[PDB]
Subunit: 115 residues, 4 copies
């Protein structure tokens, strides 16, 4: 009678990267903000989803791959994260462009439920 959902959270991860499908955006890196939640039900004893690796992988994939659409980044990153942590039962990833519009915050996300 007990359902336990563990999460690891990396929120407001901010760094600069080439990202975008419009030519003007790809001239120089721009500031983005990433939120990631990884959920699971059980790991091995003393095992953990290391937030250090997780943050470094997200930056590594974005900065090197220089994705076009945010949706392209979400597709690749989510598949990479699930392959690396097969135990996860749910993934939520949102990528926001902080400065692309002065009057709003825009972004795209993916929520994946694995059964």
């Amino acid at each position: 009678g007990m359902k336990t959902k563990q999460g690891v959270h990396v929120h407001n991860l901010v760094f600069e990267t080439i990202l975008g499908i419009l030519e003007f955006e790809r001239l120089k890196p721009q500031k983005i903000s990433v939120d990631l939640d990884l959920f699971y039900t059980q790991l091995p004893n003393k095992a953990y989803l290391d937030y250090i690796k997780i943050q470094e992988l997200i930056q590594k994939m974005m900065q090197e791959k220089q994705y076009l659409l945010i949706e392209d980044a979400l597709k690749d990153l989510s598949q990479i994260l699930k392959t690396r942590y097969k135990e996860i039962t749910e993934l939520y990833l949102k990528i926001s462009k902080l400065e692309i519009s002065p009057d709003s915050q825009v972004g795209a996300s993916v929520k994946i439920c694995y059964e």
Copy 2:
């Protein structure tokens, strides 16, 4: 065993518009803040719900139509957005009046689940 929910997000979209059912409010434009989430399961290849158009449409409809109740704006905007993006499975739209009361933030929303 995999359910994927993609989202496009325009948050804290701030602009001035005529809005309101009380006569005093309609004399001059007032500052509002709009949050929109559009969710879907699949688009065509390299297709995307362009946050640029989405933001411009919301401003265009509010500024030109000069809605009375927030609920009138929500009714019209949601129907417009779904007609324009029939693929969406869920829409969340919230419109807030930033300055109408000095001691709170008031607003109205609509969450629509399409099956």
Copy 3:
């Protein structure tokens, strides 16, 4: 194939009131913050849950009744709000004490689903 949930929202409604079960707290009014969401499926034509009345009623009940526990306020206010707006399908009300502890924000809430 369409489920529409309308909401009216009063967030971060801040005012001073007598509130508390500890004697020291009831000597003078203290600063609180109230969040209220009222959800419904349908109203009459051109009818609306007026956020003006809603905000004024919450302040009126808190300031006059000088509740003991936050839970006492939530019990009374929720019953009052549902009786006044029988059409609501869901109510969420959270009351927070802003200054009662310098190192956290504490509060209590009620979520009510009506069927």
Copy 4:
């Protein structure tokens, strides 16, 4: 036709404690932020989940036990809180390390649903 979920909330509880599995982190206390939601359906008359005790217990367990992984703290604290308040139907606890990385906020959580 009425389902009522009461909550007690301690949010952004900030204090310093020894916490961490990396040797450098355990040399000195670091700033953390804790969010706790406790939900229930019914208590006795005039009974309440005292946010004062709750906040003090969380600080007491963290500062004295000097947990290794955040997940170790979550495991212990959640079991302690449920044992102390058997009436709870749902617990959400998130612990975040405020300064461990300058470019993000990292943390871990547990959501437990009791039936």
